[PDB]
Design a protein around this ligand. Structure first.
Ligand SMILES: C[C@H]1O[C@H](O[C@H]2[C@H](O)[C@@H](O)[C@@H](O[C@@H]3C(CO)=C[C@H](N[C@H]4[C@H](O)[C@@H](O)[C@@H](O[C@H]5[C@H](O)[C@@H](O)[C@@H](O[C@@H]6C(CO)=C[C@H](N[C@H]7[C@H](O)[C@@H](O)[C@@H](O[C@H]8[C@H](O)[C@@H](O)[C@@H](O[C@H]9[C@H](O)[C@@H](O)[C@H](O)O[C@@H]9CO)O[C@@H]8CO)O[C@@H]7C)[C@H](O)[C@H]6O)O[C@@H]5CO)O[C@@H]4C)[C@H](O)[C@H]3O)O[C@@H]2CO)[C@H](O)[C@@H](O)[C@@H]1O
Ligand SMILES: C[C@H]1O[C@H](O[C@H]2[C@H](O)[C@@H](O)[C@@H](O[C@H]3[C@H](O)[C@@H](O)[C@H](O)O[C@@H]3CO)O[C@@H]2CO)[C@H](O)[C@@H](O)[C@@H]1N[C@H]1C=C(CO)[C@@H](O)[C@H](O)[C@H]1O
Ligand SMILES: OC[C@H]1O[C@H](O)[C@H](O)[C@@H](O)[C@@H]1O
Ligand SMILES: OC[C@H]1O[C@H](O)[C@H](O)[C@@H](O)[C@@H]1O
Ligand SMILES: [Ca+2]
Ligand SMILES: [Ca+2]
Ligand SMILES: [Ca+2]
Ligand SMILES: [Ca+2]
Ligand code: NA
Length: 585
C-alpha cells in the first residue's frame, strides 16, 4: 500500500524560517509528483516557484522563502511505481524571528526538575545512555536549556546515599560527601563525582541558569554501626525495651574533611527498625521527644529520624547549608519532606543560610498537602517569608481533569490562586513521586498534560517547574518548547480572568507590558473531546491587534476590535486542546 511513512518537518511542527527543504518519505518508490502546492493558509496563497526532486521513495521540496509566524500547508498528489495514487498534506507553523524585547531583569523564571526515579535503570539505561553521567549531561545541555527558557535547574540530591551508586538520593547517608569520598561502595554518586558536579554548576552559571540542591534533612540511613538504645516509656512500640538501632555515623571514608561531626543515638529521636528482633515499628528513644511539626506526630517518616532539638545537630546542618551556597555555589534548595521536620528548625536554618550571603537564596519546600487551606496553614506555621512550597493543591485539579473537570474552576484552583500566597507557589504537573513506573504514590497526569503545562507556564503568579521525564523521556519537548516560548517572550504584564469560562473551556489573558511592543497572550485550554473547534469572545486588552496561535493548532488569525475583543479558538480534544494566541507583530 502507498502511504506517507514520515516527513521532515512532521505535520504540526514549528520550524525556523531558515528551513530550506521539506522531505516526504513514502512507503513505495515514487514515479511522479502529479500535484504540489505550498500554501500560506492565512492569505490563502500558493507560493510560486517551488521545486521538487524524487529520490526513490523520498520527495524533497524546496525553493521557497518561509515567512515568520505563518501557517503553511504542503499538499501533494503522488503516483508510485505500481500506479497507486495518493493525495495528502502536511501542515507546519514558522517561528517568530523578531520576539518582544523583555528587559533581562523582568524575564520570567522557569525551573527544570532535572531528574526522574528510573534514570539509568532498566530500559532507560539502554535507551538514554547519556543519563549514566547526569552532571556531565547537564553541563553539555546548559546552552540548550537556556535557549529553551529555563532559568533554574533542580538537581536530585547530590550527596552520598545509603544505596551508593544506586541511590536516587533520598536515602541520605552523608550530606558532606558530594561524590568525593569512598563511602557506600562508590566514590561517585549515581549522578557523578563532586568535580563533575562543580563543572555542571559552572557551565549552568555560564548560561545564566541557577542551580538548586535537593536537601534531605529529615533522616539518615546506612549507618556505619548500630547501638543499643533504650526506648522511652512514651514509645508507641516497645516502650521501655532495648533495641539495636542503626544510629552510628562516623563517615570513615571522609575522615573528617569539611566537618568533624559524628552522629550517634543522641542525635536521633527514633527509628523504625530493631536489629535484635528484626521487627519494624515506630520507636522513640529514651528521653527524646518528636519534634514540633505542623500536623501532630508527623516528625517520624523513615530511617533514623534526626533530632532537631539537639543543638550540635542543628549547628552541623546549618554549617552544611551555608557550605552548599557559599562554597559549592548553589543558588537555593528544595527541602524534601518539609512537613516532617521541626518547623522551628526549618525557619532557623533558612534564615541562617539566607543571612550568610548577599545572594538571595531560593527555598521551596515539599509539603505534600492537597488542600489549599492546609498548605496556607503550614506556611503560616513555619512563618519564614522566604519559604515557597510545591502547589500540590493545584495538581489535584489536574488529576480531576483526567476524566473531566469543571474547567471554569481553574480561576480559583491551587495555592497559586490564594490571595496573599500566590507568589509562594511553585507550580508543577508531575514529579518523581507522582509519575513513576512502579510504586507511584498517586496517578500521573497521563492525559491533558499539555493543558496543565500551558496553565502553569502562562500564569502571572508562581514559579513553574517542568519535569525532565515529560520533556526528554515521554518526548513532549516539541510541544513544551512552544509553551516555553510563550512564557519566555509573551507571558508578561497583568493577568486577567474572563467571564465566559464553562465546564469545558478555561481562558486567561496576559496583557503584556505597556512599554514592550508585541508581548501578551490569550490562553485557551479545554477538557472537551468532541473534536470540534470552539470559540470564545475575549478581551485581550490589546485593541486592533492581530494574533496567531503559536501552538500550530488553529490555522487562523484573530484580529481584535477597537475595545480589544476577539473570537479566540481552541480544538476540543485531549491531544490538541490548548491554544496560545500571541501578537503577530
Ligand atoms: C545490611 C545493612 O545494614 C545496615 O542498614 C540498616 C540501615 O542503616 C538502617 O537505616 C535501616 O534501614 C531501613 C531500611 C533498610 O532497607 C528501609 C526503610 N527505609 C526504606 C523506606 O521504607 C522505603 O519506602 C524506601 O524509601 C524511599 C521512598 O520509597 C522513595 O519514594 C523516596 O522517598 C522520598 C522521600 C524520603 O526522603 C520524601 C519525599 N516525598 C514524600 C513526602 O515528603 C511525604 O510527606 C509522603 O507524602 C505523603 C503525604 O505526607 C500524605 O499525606 C499522603 O498525601 C495525601 C495528602 O496529604 C492529602 O491532602 C491528599 O488528599 O491525599 C494524599 C495522598 O497522596 O501521601 C503522600 C504520599 O505517600 O511521602 C512522599 C513520597 C521525596 O520526594 C521522596 O522521593 O526515597 C526513599 C528513600 O530511598 O526506601 C527506604 C530505604 C527503613 O525506614 C530504614 O530505617 O535498617 C538497615 C538494616 O535493615 C547498615 O547500615 C548497612 O551498612 C548494611 O548494608
Ligand atoms: C505520552 C504520555 O507520556 C506520559 O504518560 C505515561 C504515564 O505518565 C505513565 O504512568 C504510563 O501511563 C499509564 C498509566 O500509568 C495508567 O494509569 C493508564 O491506565 O495507562 C497508561 C498507559 O501506559 O505511561 C505513559 C506513557 O506511555 C505522560 O504522563 C502523559 O501525559 C503523556 N501524554 C501527553 C501526550 C500526548 C500525545 O500527544 C497527549 O495526547 C496527552 O493528552 C498528553 O497528556
Ligand atoms: O564511635 C565509633 C565506634 O564506636 C563503637 O563502639 C562502634 O561499635 C564502632 O563500630 C565505632 O567505630
Ligand atoms: O507538633 C507536632 C507534635 O507532634 C509530636 O507529638 C511532638 O512531640 C509534639 O510536641 C509536637 O507538637
Ligand atoms: Ca522528622
Ligand atoms: Ca526531638
Ligand atoms: Ca469539563
Ligand atoms: Ca505590550
Ligand atoms: Na525528630
Amino acid at each position: 500500500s502507498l502511504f506517507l511513512i514520515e516527513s521532515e518537518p512532521s505535520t504540526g511542527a514549528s520550524v525556523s524560517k531558515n528551513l530550506t527543504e521539506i522531505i516526504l518519505i513514502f512507503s513505495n518508490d515514487i514515479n511522479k509528483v502529479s500535484q504540489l502546492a505550498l500554501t500560506d493558509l492565512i492569505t490563502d496563497s500558493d507560493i510560486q516557484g517551488i521545486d521538487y526532486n524524487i529520490e526513490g521513495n523520498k520527495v524533497i521540496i524546496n525553493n521557497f522563502s518561509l515567512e515568520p509566524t505563518c501557517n503553511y500547508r504542503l499538499s501533494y498528489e503522488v503516483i508510485d511505481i505500481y500506479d497507486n495514487h495518493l493525495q495528502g498534506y502536511i501542515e507546519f507553523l514558522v517561528n517568530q524571528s523578531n520576539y518582544p524585547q523583555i528587559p533581562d531583569q523582568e524575564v520570567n523564571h522557569t525551573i527544570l526538575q532535572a531528574f526522574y526515579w528510573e534514570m539509568n535503570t532498566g530500559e532507560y539505561a539502554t535507551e538514554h545512555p547519556e543519563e549514566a553521567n547526569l552532571w556531565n549531561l547537564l553541563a553539555e545541555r546548559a546552552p540548550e536549556l537556556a535557549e529553551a527558557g529555563f532559568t533554574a535547574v533542580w538537581l536530585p540530591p547530590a550527596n552520598k546515599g545509603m544505596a551508593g551508586i544506586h541511590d536516587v538520593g533520598y536515602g541520605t547517608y552523608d550530606l558532606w560527601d558530594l561524590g568525593e569520598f569512598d563511602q557506600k561502595g562508590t566514590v561517585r554518586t549515581k549522578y557523578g563525582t563532586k568535580g563533575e558536579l562543580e563543572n555542571a554548576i559552572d557551565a549552568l552559571h555560564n548560561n545564566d541558569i541557577k542551580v538548586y540542591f535537593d536537601a534531605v534533612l529529615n533522616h539518615r540511613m546506612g549507618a556505619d554501626y548500630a547501638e543499643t538504645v533504650l526506648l522511652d516509656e512514651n514509645s508507641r512500640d516497645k516502650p521501655g525495651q532495648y533495641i539495636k538501632a542503626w544510629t552510628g555515623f562516623n563517615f570513615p571514608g571522609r575522615n573528617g574533611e569539611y566537618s568533624n561531626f559524628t552522629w550517634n543515638g543522641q542525635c536521633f529521636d527514633g527509628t523504625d527498625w530493631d536489629d535484635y528482633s528484626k521487627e519494624s515499628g515506630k520507636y522513640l528513644f529514651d528521653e527524646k521527644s518528636w519534634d514540633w511539626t505542623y500536623n501532630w506526630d508527623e516528625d517520624y517518616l523513615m530511617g533514623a529520624d534526626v533530632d532537631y532539638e539537639n543543638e550540635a545537630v542543628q549547628n552541623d546542618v546549618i554549617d552544611w547549608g551555608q557550605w552548599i551556597i557559599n562554597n559549592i555555589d548553589f543558588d537555593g534548595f528544595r527541602l524534601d519532606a518539609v512537613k516532617h521536620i521541626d518547623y522551628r528548625f526549618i525557619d532557623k536554618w533558612m534564615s541562617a543560610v539566607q543571612n550568610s550571603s548577599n545572594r538571595d537564596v531560593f527555598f521551596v519546600g515539599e509539603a505534600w498537602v492537597e488542600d489549599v487551606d492546609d498548605l496556607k496553614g503550614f506556611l503560616d506555621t513555619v512563618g519564614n517569608p522566604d519559604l515557597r512550597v510545591f502547589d500540590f493543591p493545584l495538581r489535584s485539579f489536574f488529576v480531576d481533569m483526567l476524566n473531566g473537570a469543571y474547567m471554569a474552576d481553574l480561576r480559583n484552583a491551587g495555592l497559586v490562586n490564594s490571595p496573599g500566597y500566590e507568589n509562594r507557589a511553585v507550580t508543577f504537573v508531575d514529579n518523581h513521586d507522582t509519575d513513576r513506573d512502579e510504586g507511584s504514590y498517586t496517578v500521573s497526569i497521563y492525559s491533558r498534560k499539555y493543558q496543565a503545562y500551558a496553565y502553569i507556564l502562562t500564569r502571572a503568579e508562581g514559579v513553574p517547574t517542568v519535569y525532565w521525564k515529560d520533556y526528554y523521556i515521554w518526548e513532549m519537548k516539541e510541544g513544551l518548547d512552544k509553551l516555553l516560548t510563550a512564557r519566555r517572550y509573551y507571558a508578561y504584564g497583568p493577568g486577567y480572568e474572563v467571564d465566559n469560562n464553562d465546564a469545558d473551556i478555561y481562558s486567561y489573558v496576559r496583557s503584556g507590558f505597556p512599554d514592550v511592543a508585541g508581548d501578551g497572550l490569550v490562553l485557551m485550554i479545554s477538557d472537551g473531546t468532541s473534536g470540534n473547534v470552539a470559540g470564545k469572545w475575549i478581551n485581550s486588552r490589546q485593541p486592533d491587534t492581530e494574533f496567531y496561535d503559536l501552538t500550530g493548532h488553529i490555522k487562523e488569525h484573530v484580529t481584535t476590535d477597537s475595545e480589544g475583543y476577539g473570537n479566540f479558538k481552541v480544538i476540543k480534544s485531549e491531544d490538541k486542546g490548548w491554544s496560545i494566541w500571541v501578537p503577530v507583530e
